[PDB]
Design a protein around this ligand. Structure first.
Ligand SMILES: [Cu+2]
Ligand SMILES: [Cu+2]
Ligand code: NA
Ligand code: NA
Lengths: 620, 620
């Protein structure tokens, strides 16, 4: 019955049928995006209306459409033709990935470039890379991908070991034309292989690892009902999945005594961008919005038992649309399990003689996606004590280049002649807050040092201050690690037993934000990434920090336009957007396959509960 | 045979015998500190000399002594009388804990204070708190403890629920005199109990947690030899234990191919301080140096299987001296186990068709200690990929006070009338570095933003800079989270295959450092805590950031005096001292027993290896 249930294969085929019936999905049409819409606010006694949002591309060059369908009612609610030069191109289609290499393989300029480097065209892979928005006027309103080349010596070879630097091509994937081929000069193609399953490179595999066995003989402590409704150790939520955002959590709530207390209405990673910091013209345009441009959900891995996810695992297998509107299952695409998390609380009291130890656990909801060379794990954690955490795990193969003779300020060396351009991976978490309901506010909390003097004669006092962010113009905030800055989301109308507003505190990692010059194209397109925290008033159409259409789309949409409205956020339905990222200067240890690195954030209860919420956890 | 082996019961009894034989351990003498000394540098072909350092207190009022004994040779190497007014008092003796309450129980001023509050003296516990150094001239050269009172309603009651505010006493624990009783006025003693095993407060215990079983059917992948030498997944180290510092790691090295490569010579938590930020005269003197004043190792818990440490656990049971020089075993005081740590590396490659996943693991070496209300877990982690990490887990019961009518800028409310003064927990990790041997240097690495302009026309470039810290005067550094500041320890004489010095990068959490006014007593006594990173030239007598004697000891010793020497640290035997801490504004959720909170740091290889060191980890 849940209006938050995962999309079924049947609903997707039904959307297909409705669009077909309506004349919107003929043979030249392709689905670039399809997802279920969340229920509107209120929607109390009102019967459910499952609605789907669809972006439809036309391979014949006609304008794309944005369409909303009611699958419940079998109707098209709205359909509007898009002017992509204005509002943005549709997300990259998986079918376009191969097109760059295919078109380049018969282009005389490309072939001349490959011949100058003595490279067999049959061995040259071309990465289909998002184009962004630069100085090329002819690209405006055209679907462009840019291609960087990598040599694959044999079918199972890692092409990333062999970048072809000094060469880039631009391609119109609809008209199927190569617009530009730029060759700035030959660089040596790095020769060492990067084949991490080749015994010559690995050496003899370790025989020293003894097995670890994690089992739950009575099964897991969480229940799954209605397909995706999770109940675990007082927590309640629904696990959604969207082809753009990936795993989305809905209705995160905690059962405190008899009462189900909302905390977060919707949590997602609403954007992620990977800006590169190499000023070479071969790569200076490189910024991958994995979520907005490529749709991370679409590329979610099927996760193998005892390998990707260890322990007693419950899987969800979300269904997505292919390019024609047929359902496609991502088998075992979401892992759900609980795990031990060390000591929760411990005290050995001299005076009472009582020794007390309790163990912690967390519920884990995760998926892993692959886009080209990159592989990212997205992990949501719920802890016994009320803490909510997100962690991203970045791995894969580093994006490579040549390593310049005489070195580089913007590229590190991985292997002889092999470079790795500096870059960042920056995420935006969109947290549609509902601390004890929708009436919320945000305060910025800083530690306050105090001067030795009257009232502080020993010079030991310290304090803190909280500043309420009252309107959206005041709610674009930066980190201040030195002063221990955090942000508290509270409900001014819901007080704990000590008469203080209930709240949750967001703890950031305070990693660097977007490094690009503020006048760059990427600083405008990824404006969200320039500041650590934004707070907006909730609106149904403010979904992504970069707007609905990111591909080849300039500034003009997203967070900077949302906050211009300068809406009241002091005791209102609000949304927190937290920017957090990794800044990567690749090291030799990242090659030939990168060990996981992590980044994230957490929210901890801050006077939400009337005392510790884990007093009822049993011993041992 | 290892000169780094744990002290045996026999060695301790032998030290006792040598001191006795030498006339240094008569009936009025007490051992306040006893520990094995590390081998001197070089000590190659030279036969082993196990030496012990002892601080001897005299209960009759005579001056204490510092003594070094050769247990191998049965000799006293040196014995020197200490002037405590100058160099500091000896650490607090466990036998002195009870003395404060005992002396106060027959003092007429104390009894008057208790009677004014209608408190039964038999029910009043007194915390034996370190005194520090303030304005009281008569305390100089005297062993003083200060006492704060807490009511215990019955034998199993948590006294921390019932602080007696407005009252403090100072006591000379040698002459057995109460020097001062200060009563600033009555406060209500908070009435609610804080008994977290009482069913009335917990409610019915959860029946929802299904078991998690962690087993290793073939046993653990690490070996223990010589009592405390660990070998695990290419790592090699010796696990030491000292009554002051607790678990100390020696000779951390990694077997890279055929060659055992040193990384860290000695790693310890060399100090930890808990400064309180309440300007009330009842607590404004409160700063607990758990390591330096109380000796954290001494209070290490015996850790129960399947409770404190879960999985296939190997224990060490370190031996310490009691006050008379008799050995005392801390049964199961150190836990050692390996655990799964999620995905290590993963890539699913479109072009090669190869899908690759490997799992991570870490070796964990831990102990847990209790000092009064506080309980701290100290965890060292070694990861497959070469990462070394430390984590402290803080739990226990928060130190309480009254909560003032009309509120407080320096105390939070936990329960009706119950306060928790703001405070910090600040650690110093002493890392005697040995990156590929002893010839090391430290660089500070900051991210460098670049301006859009010539050479960076798109405004995307970013870089980094490294500054070598050449002399100790230049090596007192602060965090800069905004610029992603880290510190790299490298060996300028050992290059990787890419001709770059091998190194490790220290990643800090960039939490606030000591908040107290710089003119305070605590800013001088805990000077180390005012800055994030110090680098010194190694010296055998520079062990602690606060010097050898912290108790009632002013500034004058420790890190500020070490660096005045302004020694060369550019390619020399160096020591990194990293300050890191938690700043705690207690929340209602911390009451009546605190969920674990964590802080720490890690070091990751930075061009130490010639490629990923985990290419030889097997599948599944
Ligand atoms: Cu990266
Ligand atoms: Cu604390
Ligand atoms: Na909201
Ligand atoms: Na050293």
């Amino acid at each position: 019955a849940s209006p938050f249930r995962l999309a079924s294969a049947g609903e997707i085929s039904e959307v297909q049928g409705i669009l077909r019936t309506a004349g919107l999905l003929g043979p030249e049409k392709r689905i670039a995006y399809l997802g279920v819409l969340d229920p509107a606010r209120g929607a109390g006694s009102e019967a459910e209306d499952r609605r789907f949002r669809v972006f439809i591309h036309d391979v014949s060059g006609a304008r794309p459409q944005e369409v909303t369908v009611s699958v419940t009612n079998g109707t098209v609610i709205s359909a509007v033709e898009l002017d992509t030069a204005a509002t943005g191109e549709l997300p990259v289609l998986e079918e376009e990935f191969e097109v760059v290499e295919q078109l380049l393989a018969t282009d005389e300029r490309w072939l001349k470039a490959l011949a100058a480097r003595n490279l067999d065209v049959s061995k040259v892979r071309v990465a289909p890379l998002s184009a962004g928005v630069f100085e090329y006027a002819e690209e405006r309103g055209r679907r462009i991908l840019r291609g960087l080349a990598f040599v694959q010596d044999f079918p199972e070879d890692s092409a990333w070991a062999h970048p072809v630097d000094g060469l880039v091509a631009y391609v119109d994937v609809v008209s199927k034309e190569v617009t530009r081929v730029i060759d700035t000069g030959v660089f040596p193609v790095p020769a060492e292989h990067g084949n991490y399953t080749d015994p010559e490179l690995t050496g003899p595999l370790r025989t020293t690892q003894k097995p670890i066995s994690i089992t739950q003989p009575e099964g897991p402590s969480f229940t799954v009902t209605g397909g995706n409704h999770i109940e675990w150790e007082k927590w309640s939520l629904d696990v959604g999945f969207d082809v753009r955002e990936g795993v989305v959590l809905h209705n995160i709530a905690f059962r405190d005594g008899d009462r189900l207390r909302p905390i977060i209405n919707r949590a997602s990673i609403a954007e992620m961008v990977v800006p590169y910091g190499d000023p070479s013209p071969i790569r200076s345009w490189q910024n991958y919005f994995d979520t907005g441009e490529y749709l991370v959900g679409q590329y979610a891995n099927s996760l193998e038992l005892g390998c990707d996810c260890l322990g007693d695992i419950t899987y969800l297998s979300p269904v997505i649309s292919d390019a024609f509107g047929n359902p496609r299952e991502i088998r075992n695409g979401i892992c759900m399990h609980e795990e031990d998390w060390g000591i929760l609380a411990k005290h050995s009291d001299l005076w009472s003689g009582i020794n007390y130890t309790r163990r912690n656990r967390r519920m884990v909801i995760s998926f892993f996606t692959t886009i080209g060379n990159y592989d990212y794990g997205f992990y949501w954690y719920l802890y016994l004590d009320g803490t909510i955490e997100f962690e991203a795990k970045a791995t894969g193969v580093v994006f490579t280049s040549a390593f310049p003779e005489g070195g580089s300020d913007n590229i590190s060396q991985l292997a002889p002649g092999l470079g790795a351009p500096f870059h960042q991976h920056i995420f935006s978490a969109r947290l549609d807050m509902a601390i004890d309901g929708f009436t919320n506010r945000v305060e910025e909390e800083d530690v306050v040092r105090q001067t030795m003097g009257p009232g502080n004669e020993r010079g030991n006092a310290f304090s803190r201050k909280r500043t309420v962010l009252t309107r959206e113009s005041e709610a674009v905030r930066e980190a201040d690690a030195r002063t221990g800055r955090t942000w508290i989301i509270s409900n001014p109308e819901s007080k704990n037993r000590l008469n203080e507003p209930v709240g949750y505190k967001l703890h950031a990692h305070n990693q660097p934000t977007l490094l690009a010059d503020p006048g760059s194209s990427i600083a405008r397109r990824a404006a969200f990434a320039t500041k650590d925290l934004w707070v907006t008033r909730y609106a149904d159409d403010e979904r992504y920090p970069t707007g609905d259409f990111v591909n080849q789309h300039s500034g003009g949409a997203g967070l900077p336009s949302y906050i211009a409205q300068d809406r009241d956020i002091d005791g209102q339905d609000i949304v927190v957007w937290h920017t957090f990222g990794l800044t990567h200067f690749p090291r030799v240890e990242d090659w030939p396959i990168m060990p996981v690195d992590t980044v994230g954030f957490k929210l901890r209860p801050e006077g939400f509960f009337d005392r510790s919420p884990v007093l009822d956890v049993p011993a041992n």
